[PDB]
Design a protein around this ligand. Sequence first.
Ligand SMILES: COC1=C(OC)C(=O)C(C/C=C(\C)CC/C=C(\C)CC/C=C(\C)CC/C=C(\C)CC/C=C(/C)CC/C=C(\C)CC/C=C(\C)CC/C=C(\C)CC/C=C(\C)CCC=C(C)C)=C(C)C1=O
Ligand SMILES: CCCCCCCCCCCCCCCCCC(=O)OC[C@H](COP(=O)(O)OCCN)OC(=O)CCCCCCCCCCCCCCCCC
Ligand SMILES: CCCCCCCCCC(=O)OC[C@H](COP(=O)(O)OCCC(C)C)OC(=O)CCCCCCC
Ligand SMILES: CCCCCCCCCCCC
Lengths: 174, 117, 100, 70, 315, 96, 341, 116, 66
Amino acid sequence: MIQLMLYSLIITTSIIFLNMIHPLALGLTLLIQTIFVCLLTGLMTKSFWYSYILFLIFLGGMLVLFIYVTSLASNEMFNLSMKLTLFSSLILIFMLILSFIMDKTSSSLFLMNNDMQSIINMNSYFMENSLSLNKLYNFPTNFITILLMNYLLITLIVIVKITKLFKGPIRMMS
Amino acid sequence: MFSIIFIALLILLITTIVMFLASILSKKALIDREKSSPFECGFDPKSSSRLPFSLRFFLITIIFLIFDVEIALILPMIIIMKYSNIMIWTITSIIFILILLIGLYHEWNQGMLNWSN
Amino acid sequence: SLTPFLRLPLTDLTGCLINHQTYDKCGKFEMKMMECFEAYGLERGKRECADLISDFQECVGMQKQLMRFHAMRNERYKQWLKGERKGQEFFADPPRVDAY
Amino acid sequence: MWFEILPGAVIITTLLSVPIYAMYGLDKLMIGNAFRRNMDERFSRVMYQRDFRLTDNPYKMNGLEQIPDE
Amino acid sequence: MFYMEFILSLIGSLLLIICVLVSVAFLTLLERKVLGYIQIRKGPNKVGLMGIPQPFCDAIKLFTKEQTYPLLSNYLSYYISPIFSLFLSLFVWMCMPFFVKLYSFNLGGLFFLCCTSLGVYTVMVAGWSSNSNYALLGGLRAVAQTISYEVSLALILLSFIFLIGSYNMIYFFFYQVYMWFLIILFPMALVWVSISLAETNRTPFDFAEGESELVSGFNVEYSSGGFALIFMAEYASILFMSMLFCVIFLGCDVFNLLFYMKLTFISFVFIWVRGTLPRFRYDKLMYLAWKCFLSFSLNYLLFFIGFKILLFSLL
Amino acid sequence: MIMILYWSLPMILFILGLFCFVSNRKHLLSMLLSLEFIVLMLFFMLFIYLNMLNYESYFSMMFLTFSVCEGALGLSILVSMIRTHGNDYFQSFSIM
Amino acid sequence: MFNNSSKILFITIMIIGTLITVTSNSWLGAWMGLEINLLSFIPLLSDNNNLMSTEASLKYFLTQVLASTVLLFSSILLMLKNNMNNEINESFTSMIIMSALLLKSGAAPFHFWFPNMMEGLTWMNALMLMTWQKIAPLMLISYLNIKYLLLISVILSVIIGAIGGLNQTSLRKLMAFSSINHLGWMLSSLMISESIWLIYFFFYSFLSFVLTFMFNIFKLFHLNQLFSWFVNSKILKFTLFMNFLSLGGLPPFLGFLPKWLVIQQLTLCNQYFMLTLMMMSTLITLFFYLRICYSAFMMNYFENNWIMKMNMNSINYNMYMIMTFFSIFGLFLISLFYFMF
Amino acid sequence: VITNNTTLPEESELNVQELNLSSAALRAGAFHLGKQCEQANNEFMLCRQELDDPRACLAEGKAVTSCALDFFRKVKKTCHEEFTQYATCLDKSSGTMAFSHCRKTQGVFDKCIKDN
Amino acid sequence: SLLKRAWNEIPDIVGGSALALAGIVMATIGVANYYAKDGDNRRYKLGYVVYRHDDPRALKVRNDED
Ligand SMILES: COC1=C(OC)C(=O)C(C/C=C(\C)CC/C=C(\C)CC/C=C(\C)CC/C=C(\C)CC/C=C(/C)CC/C=C(\C)CC/C=C(\C)CC/C=C(\C)CC/C=C(\C)CCC=C(C)C)=C(C)C1=O
Ligand SMILES: CCCCCCCCCCCCCCCCCC(=O)OC[C@H](COP(=O)(O)OCCN)OC(=O)CCCCCCCCCCCCCCCCC
Ligand SMILES: CCCCCCCCCC(=O)OC[C@H](COP(=O)(O)OCCC(C)C)OC(=O)CCCCCCC
Ligand SMILES: CCCCCCCCCCCC
């Protein structure tokens, strides 16, 4: 029931996100979108780690983007429309009705949770995020992690090169 | 996590009831023309706050974003120490923190952690 | 799986990225498919490993099992709409939670 | 002089001690066990499923009186 | 899951919310009394019996004064932000390690970091939507402050987690049965006290609400309920990081009254730093949390990585 | 039907995000936010794929790292617009 | 590359990312290699003293980020349906993978970013854009056995890249439209023989790498800058302009050989109609090559009077004239080669 | 999936008496149970690992449940009240039933086991 | 020369570098102590593992005292 509610909320916020001209409307819409996407991703995995990781990522990213909102397109008009509110309300109540009259066994995800796994699975009895995150630090794929460290260092070098700090601060009509 | 959703909705409901009770029991006086105006320390503003703001720490913000996704790859290895090869875990962990120290000390050497000015 | 074009030492890290060998129920089937993908090749394996490809595909993708389940669920609701299945006896006896 | 700081601090000490100790009563009123079952590990959750399968109360314990004489 | 649980989880969460709110009120009373006694003067003494119902005087007045309907503001975004600020500042308190099963937070550090990042989001939304220059400056100072302390707060937490081996804060109790972690982590007792004041926007890092650099910071257009929920959100954040100083550095036991005495003492320390040290500049805050705190966090993380490999071979 | 009942939704939301990315907007930062949305829906679809498999969800952080470095590249391009222009209007840039 | 060692670092990470892409046995490793290549190639192509180079970098960034996200989307769909890294029978998600690869490569009808962005570049970054950045999407097209979509891309690329290059008198956009026309010959060879594609790509990159050096050294950004270009002997300019007849496919020059091996391998594989469609395309490419060749074939020109001495680099002009000899008299090495057997 | 060609054990085979003790009663006396049922548990889990088929090792599961039932009858005949006190202490002493929370009743139960 | 300037102007960096060098030395000592004995064959094993007598992993099983 909660998964179908998250489906309906993600659909309604995606309709809202496709229709917003103002960057702050897009920012708040993608705030509630990443909240609902973080909860939905959690439902699929045995543990709740990557939802938390994705939330730290997408709250570390738009924290910067608001500073660029206040530095570029700080002055732009909001335009509320009754058509979008009526459309979102009608679609939202229609999908809550459709989710209430639906069989929730057929609409549930086939991905296995921590309790959907059987009792005979001895790997399920370990600590909940151990075997999932193991291959980041194991022998076949530590070199991809090495490549990611060097990639992030090269990324930082690129950011320093193409954002020249000695040219001055950035604003509109600089 | 389903209980956390319900208690988060209950906290949001309780705070909205608290704010609406603060609005209902507030003193209802008539709105003056210059009461609603922005403060600006007692004088006329000359400029709206929607005027563009100068950013002197753009490089620090993007370095913060890069370092935060670097934080997102450190948090696994608390769990991974008891279940992996100790040699590979130490090579990855000490090489991770030393590469971060090379990057941070190199940008300290260039002075890119200082605000543009 | 695919092939490395102009393969170098840089493909040794990439080659072990996503596979079913790490504690998965399907991987042995996948391993068998990889066996003929090492024997027949990538192009003769599309024709001479049609049995081993399909077993891995409906083992990890679970296509035929989920089509079976959705045919079992739709027939019960179809019998309820047609009136053959009573509303009180619409669902069967539930399994024990200690089962599976 | 300085002791008047202690009114206003003990209330922070007492009231924040309220939501733990009250549950140490409020479980014992209805659960019968002062500690409700923790669900951190998978095995504790599976054995909680076993207890709630055996009895409607998972905190009601089946002793040796359940076992038949033979 | 048993039905009674849900009921007792709801009851314990609501009782925790009510007790944290009244403890926020008496924390304002405690700050106004000892912060006076930081100087020569006294605290509130006349109203009520001995100043005890003084937060009730402060709460009756702020719930009855006229709501500001500002002119150039976006009122539909200005009205909602203190509600969300109080909502996350009370929602973070569900992470509290109970010895009973309140909530099985296996990932309490990540939950704490998420609510920590979200509280400053409410602060910077309330700063922008007031449509005042001082409010926008306080909001941008809050964004620069959280960009300064966020990665430093995370890496310092990881070092404590390494001493635990798990992300569940009740496992802090088993590793502190013989002694407190104040013996080992005294440089990050200082560093976590520095970060926790930057988390709660408190002196020496009070740039989001400045009384001399700006005029009340981002609270310049908030009055009579919006200011009240913003103020309780800030003080509940102060109570939460006082609790987290008591969890990590001190004993994580909750069945002793000495824990709540220690929490009142760490709250007194939070008042005590404000009454002694002057405020920084946020230029020096950004030069501090990027070149000193982050480097020390990475270095002592290396020290804990080596010590945990040394300890694991001996076991 | 099986492709319709499972994972048909994030294809539709990714198509809506792609249409939000290419729509006639005044500013580049709206396109950066649409990039963040299509990162979110690619995370959803990749997470469905990595959770059919049991213990291969470690890859889900690498995609986050490459996507954040994409966003950092876009943010630094947005800084480099100010080094040459005074604005981020897409009409103000050269069409040829 | 020029004026900084960090650009040499960016070239190193460029080579590393492209070789990570083309060696990947999974689409996800190829995707992250494309991310590394994009990360490497944004800072080269960015210059704050040029107002149009940043716009060209923005156009490249938006085009590659849109094409990389569609590529990962259809890769995830291919893993969702046919759970191995490839597909047994061809379907629509393979066409979405091929279309997202064709947006990276710059082939028609997804070609429109490519000469509109090349006006903002220098010549060395143009050479890196239309030679090395076509390694990674074209080598990933080889894993897909789709004939109609590739054939439509081939026909559209050879039609547009010939017709479109007639209007521009700027050498960068004209050479970009020439690279679109030579992309169609590469994609036509991609579904008959991967080795023949490698040979056409190597000789096309050789002719591009020698025609860039004539424009990079003397800074020839326009067609009339060729007419005003001073040489100390007009026979030297006559010989240096024979590389355009080489790139047009005229024998007995070197560039007849890769076109000829593509035509031989196409006729052995029983394709005749699209080969005939590519015969009419390369006449128009040779036609807008000849407008450059007007600047040296008439042997005497009404030239500007003030300039009297021509200037060049030492090592760059030394390396330029090794390859100009092999772009004219390169068919004498037909006996030495052993790839084509 | 399960088809008509695959055999299954009948309902008369699976209708035997099963251990219906709670979690605190199983955790109390858990260390003394495996010293008596070391042979059945190891054989059943070894043949459950490699055979990996629930139809196999059914008699091994019968032997495991019979050994556990015989041990619980032996506990029930002699000083049932000490086991009741230990199981009640282990249930009521902590959330996760750790043996370290109360050890006095564990000592009394081990003293009764050693005396009997 | 440069150590006195770094110890005068940035002393927390010098103290952190000493702590990190001590951590690198202790990591080397811990890895060498882990691999000096049979550290891969741990005494207590996660899960329920049973080995037959003819298995090659059977004679590697430790018989130490708790
Ligand atoms: C030389 O030149 C100069 C001049 O020329 C001569 C000048 O003139 C001036 C100008 C100067 C002057 C005019 C005077 C000088 C100024 C000063 C001395 C100012 C400096 C002093 C201070 C700032 C004071 C010291 C600071 C303190 C004490 C910190 C605390 C201060 C506060 C204001 C905090 C109080 C606010 C509160 C308490 C908010 C109220 C909210 C609540 C109480 C909410 C809590 C709620 C509860 C407890 C209960 C709620 C429960 C609920 C909702 C749930 C319950 C439910 C149930 C069911 C029970 C200057 C500067 C100058 O230089
Ligand atoms: C994570 C991000 C999430 C983002 C999405 C969040 C969405 C949340 C829901 C949004 C709903 C919006 C509804 C808006 C309705 C009001 C619109 C409005 O603007 O009202 C204006 C009004 C006065 O403002 P005005 O005069 O316009 O002044 C501005 C001039 N510059 O303003 C007002 O009067 C202020 C509002 C007063 C509301 C009072 C409601 C009536 C009372 C309700 C019951 C209270 C009961 C309390 C006691 C209970 C006891 C059990
Ligand atoms: C209005 C919402 C504000 C934002 C809340 C963000 C919470 C943290 C991010 C996240 O995904 O956390 C995953 C966590 C996962 O749970 P945990 O892993 O923390 O705990 C297990 C849970 C009963 C064992 C402890 O979920 C939440 O925090 C629930 C959020 C409810 C939101 C309600 C409104 C839609
Ligand atoms: C900088 C590297 C730290 C870790 C070193 C691990 C290997 C130590 C020596 C092992 C010899 C067998």
